[model samples]
Target: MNIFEMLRIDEGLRLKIYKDTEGYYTIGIGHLLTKSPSLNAAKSELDKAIGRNTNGVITKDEAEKLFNQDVDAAVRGILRNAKLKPVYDSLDAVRRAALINMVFQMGETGVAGFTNSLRMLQQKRWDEMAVNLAKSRWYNQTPNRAKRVITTFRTGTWDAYK
Candidate 1:
């Protein structure tokens, strides 16, 4: 699957406000209202979705718009990291999607912080890369999601989702 669709499956769709795993106020497909660089834009999008709906619900269309924006933001953030670009370029779409999924869940800085894992990935040491990723709090907290991404990296296929 493409990155967008994969995110839909992983992040899931939530039109109402809820607390994420890390206790951040989130809405619309894993969007965190806190610490966003484009906080104003996000609030504007939320306003567009539910101007006066105190019920805190957003339409599916509105949710999708937010989801697309969030995904694009993750992609751009990944590209902005000097260490990630060449490695990203060396990867296929499927593997790239794995990276994007990770960046969405953990900010690009967090992903980049996996220095050993990044080195393993850049060297195409698939299992070693997966192993390195497994040695993290992220893997412990979201094993299922992390498993899928790690499997994607290991196999170079979408078989992880299946």
Candidate 2:
């Protein structure tokens, strides 16, 4: 059988947005709507649907399976295209996670341009790394996110900012 047919059998086809058993909105082969639509957009879409309500449903397991696939793809994108591949590989889990998060927030290319930050991280200078992050254009653009990531990198703990 074709891969297309196989995927259809695996994900199950749904032509409209519907609520799962857990009450999350989903549609079209178990794609979960993690990001809610704008007020007017959602209402308009629902109005266009035949039933005008989310009746069709998929199991939680199916939705999670789809979510994992998407997450894996994103992680792979980070791993494959990261400029500092050797340095990234050398870092511990917390530092690795921080780098991946930065790449996700800003594209891999953009994150790679953070030479001062990368140099500090490679030298194991956590304080300097934090300082570099604080002084970046990225930090200026999104102070809150930079604070979380910088704290994690400095402390080398996943729960530092949590």
Candidate 3:
């Protein structure tokens, strides 16, 4: 089964959708407790959800777990923030989901480092985003995963196997 299936998040997690005064969701996992979405929490949760899927500081299993658990919720929160939401919202859902997935594995700053990718999405430059997505440190390190997600963003379909 895919990570989504393993996590049983076919519909994705529904967070509080709005934050309390703390800038973090009052009701959720890592993000709530940390006053920000916690990558460490994501790693811990992902390790549980995806089993043995990756290597290094965070594995593919860890990433998949994040995808199933905190990834979408955390990114949705990122998009809710006024500074980032407008740019995030303008992308096609598939691309946005891909972005969220990327961020889930890579952390906010790591994900945000994709300046070119973000710019292309803001400009509605789908092809460019695809190209940029494929050229990041993320892509080089995790070609299989990067290729799969890029396919989803470009084609608007989840063709990649987890």
Candidate 4:
């Protein structure tokens, strides 16, 4: 099954994706890692906003704004590349979708805080990734949601939604 199916995209969002006639990819929020209809432009703007580093220390307000921006960006990125081999080479489509969803709520910088998890992913170490995923602010702030995602990511399942 495709990642989109696993994510169970609601009709509203699916409509937005399919009927993106208004060029919904170009708009952007300043200081946020979000994107719009003009992907090239959005990427350019967000790159300038977040700078190049993924340090993981943004204020909540800053992060939230960026998170909202990047929700669409994350979705689009996954749809375009499907695989994030540089970091999550072993990730299946379902896990990638959930990770992208989580990253949508956490800005790139915020998500980058999962240093150990990223490392584990790079090493194709699912067990270690699950352990490390529980050690971040994502765990402290999101409880079961993060846990479910980590489990799904580790097991390569789409059951996080359940």
lDDT of 4 by residue, 32-76 (tens): 323455555554554466564323233445544554555567665
Residue-by-residue lDDT tens digits, candidate 2, 108-151: 68877888778888889999789878987778866766786788
Candidate 4 vs. true structure, TM-score: 0.51
Give the alpha carbon lDDT tens digit for every residue of 96-125 in model 1.
Answer: 999999999888888888899888888999
Find the number of clashing residue pairs for candidate 3: 4
Best by TM-score: 1
Taking all chains together, each candidate's TM-score versus the true structure is: 0.87, 0.56, 0.54, 0.51
lDDT of each: 0.82, 0.61, 0.55, 0.53
Using alpha carbons, what is the TM-score of model 3? 0.54
- The top-ranked prediction according to lDDT is 1
Worst 10 residues of 4 by lDDT: 10-19
Q: Which stretches of candidate 4 lie above 4 Å from their native place?
A: 1-70, 76-85, 88-90
* lDDT of prediction 3: 0.55
- Give the per-residue Cα lDDT of candidate 2 at 151: 80
lDDT of 3 by residue, 1-162 (tens): 333442233223333223434354322222322344764554444344436432214433433445445755656666765545766678765566666666555566676666777777788776878888887776786676678777777776666644
Give candidate 2 regions above 4 Å deviation.
1-70
